[PDB]
C-alpha cells in the first residue's frame, strides 16, 4: 500500500458540472519542490493534509 | 437531621410506600381491581394486578404532599395518556375517574388526607407523619 | 426454534459456558445458546444472586455483564 501524504497549499477553485468538485494544488510532505494539482470531493481548507492512492494522474479540469 | 419526601427520589419512595401499604393490611380496595383497564385510552389491565392499586395510592399521596390540593379531574389528566384511536392520530385522553375517587376515599378513611376548603383534598396531620416516616428509612436502605 | 423451558440439558449448559463468556446479555444468551429470551432475563438474575457474573451497568433496555473472576 504505497499511500502518499500531501497537503493543500492553494485552493484553485471549483470544477465539474454541478460544482461539487474542488481543484487544489498539493505539496508532497516528503520533498519540497514537487507539487501536483488534483481535485477533491468534500470541503477543504487551507493547509489541510491529504491522502493519495497514487500521485501520477495529474488531474485536469472536470467537465 | 430531618428528611422529607422531597429529599428522596420519586420512584423508590413510591415502591417503598406501596410495599408499606402492602404489609399494613387495610386499604379497602374495591372489588373491580382485576377487571378495570384504569383508563379509557389504555389497552390492557395493569400487569401487577396485586399491587397496582397500592402503587396508585402511594403515587397519589406523594402528589398531594408536593402540591397544595388536587381533585379527581387533576388526577385524571395527570395519569391519563395518549390514546391510539387506530387509523386516526393520537390525542390526550384522561384517566379513569372512579379509581382516582376510590383511591382518594380510601386515603381519607385510613387518615392520611382530609377534605379541604376551596375544593380538593389536602394532606392531613398524620399525613405528613406517615409520609415522613416512609421518607425516613428509604435513605438508610443501603445497609 | 428457541427453548422456553429448562429440561436439565439446558441448565448445565449455563454453568460451564457462560463463565467462558466475557460479555453476556439478553441477546448473548439467545445467540450462542438457543433460549427464549424471557429465560435470558431470568438467568441473568440467577447468575446474580450467586456469584457467576458481576454487573457494571443496569438498565431495563440493556443489561451488560462480565465474569466474576
Amino acid at each position: 500500500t504505497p499511500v502518499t501524504l500531501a497537503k493543500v497549499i492553494k485552493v484553485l477553485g471549483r470544477t465539474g458540472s454541478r460544482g461539487g468538485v474542488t481543484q487544489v494544488r498539493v505539496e508532497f510532505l516528503e520533498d519540497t519542490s514537487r507539487t501536483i494539482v488534483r481535485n477533491v470531493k468534500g470541503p477543504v481548507r487551507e493547509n489541510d493534509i491529504l491522502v493519495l492512492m497514487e500521485s501520477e494522474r495529474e488531474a485536469r479540469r472536470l467537465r | 437531621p430531618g428528611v422529607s419526601v422531597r429529599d428522596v427520589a420519586a420512584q423508590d419512595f413510591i415502591n417503598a410506600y406501596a410495599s408499606f401499604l402492602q404489609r399494613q393490611g387495610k386499604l379497602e380496595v374495591p372489588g373491580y381491581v382485576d377487571i378495570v383497564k384504569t383508563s379509557s385510552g389504555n389497552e390492557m389491565p395493569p400487569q401487577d394486578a396485586e399491587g397496582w392499586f397500592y402503587k396508585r395510592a402511594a403515587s397519589v399521596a406523594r402528589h398531594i404532599y408536593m402540591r397544595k390540593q388536587v381533585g379527581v379531574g387533576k388526577l385524571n389528566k395527570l395519569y391519563g395518556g395518549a390514546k391510539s384511536r387506530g387509523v386516526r392520530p393520537y390525542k390526550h385522553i384522561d384517566a379513569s375517574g372512579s379509581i382516582n375517587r376510590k383511591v382518594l376515599q380510601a386515603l381519607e378513611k385510613i387518615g392520611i388526607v382530609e377534605i379541604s376548603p376551596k375544593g380538593g383534598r389536602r394532606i392531613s396531620e398524620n399525613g405528613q407523619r406517615d409520609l415522613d416516616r416512609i421518607a425516613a428509612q428509604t435513605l438508610e436502605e443501603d445497609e | 426454534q428457541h427453548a422456553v423451558i429448562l429440561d436439565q440439558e439446558k441448565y448445565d449448559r449455563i454453568l460451564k459456558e457462560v463463565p467462558t463468556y466475557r460479555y453476556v446479555s439478553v441477546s448473548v444468551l439467545v445467540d450462542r445458546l438457543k433460549i427464549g429470551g424471557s429465560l435470558a432475563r431470568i438467568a441473568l438474575r440467577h447468575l446474580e444472586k450467586e456469584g457467576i457474573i458481576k454487573p457494571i451497568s443496569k438498565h431495563s433496555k440493556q443489561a451488560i455483564y462480565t465474569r466474576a473472576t
Binding site: - | - | 423451558i5 429448562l6 429465560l39
Partner: protein, 145 residues
C-alpha cells in the same frame, strides 16, 4: 431467581374448545387463538380461574384447564360483569352470552341471515358484498376478493 426444573408434565400443542392452542407461549396469549376470546377476555378468565400468568401453556395440567374452560362457557355465575360479555340481550332471548370458538361463525351467520331475510338495508348491502357502514366507496375498498 425463579426457574423450575419441570420436564415431564410439560405438553406440546394441545386442544381446548376443539381448537389447537399453542403450547410454548404464555397462557394469556395462548388462549387468544380461540376465535371468540381476545387478549383482555383471556386475561380476565385466567385471574378468575386462579392461574399464574407467568406460566407457559405447556404447563397448566388438566384440572385447572377444566377450570379455565368452565369459566369460559359460564362467565355470569363467576362475578364477571355483563358489559364484558360478547352478546348482551342479544337478538332473541334477552340473556347474556359470550360466544366462543365454533359458535362465532354460527351466531354471526344467524345475525347476517336475520337482517337479510328481513330485507333491511344492512342485509342487502351484506348480500351485495358492499361496505355496510357509512363509509365512502368511490376510491377505497378496491380488490374485493
Amino acid at each position: 431467581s425463579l426457574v423450575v426444573q419441570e420436564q415431564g408434565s410439560f405438553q406440546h400443542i394441545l386442544r381446548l374448545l376443539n381448537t389447537n392452542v399453542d403450547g410454548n407461549i404464555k397462557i394469556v396469549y395462548a388462549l387468544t387463538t380461540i376465535k371468540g376470546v381476545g387478549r383482555r377476555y383471556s386475561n380476565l378468565v385466567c385471574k378468575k380461574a386462579d392461574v399464574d400468568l407467568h406460566k407457559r401453556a405447556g404447563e397448566l395440567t388438566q384440572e385447572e384447564l377444566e377450570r379455565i374452560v368452565q369459566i369460559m362457557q359460564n362467565p355470569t355465575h363467576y362475578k364477571i360483569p355483563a358489559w364484558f360479555l360478547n352478546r348482551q340481550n342479544d337478538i332473541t332471548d334477552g340473556k347474556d352470552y359470550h360466544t366462543l370458538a365454533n359458535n362465532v361463525e354460527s351466531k354471526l351467520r344467524d345475525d347476517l341471515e336475520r337482517l337479510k331475510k328481513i330485507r333491511a338495508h344492512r342485509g342487502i348491502r351484506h348480500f351485495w358484498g358492499l361496505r355496510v357502514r357509512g363509509q365512502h366507496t368511490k376510491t377505497t375498498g378496491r380488490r374485493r376478493a
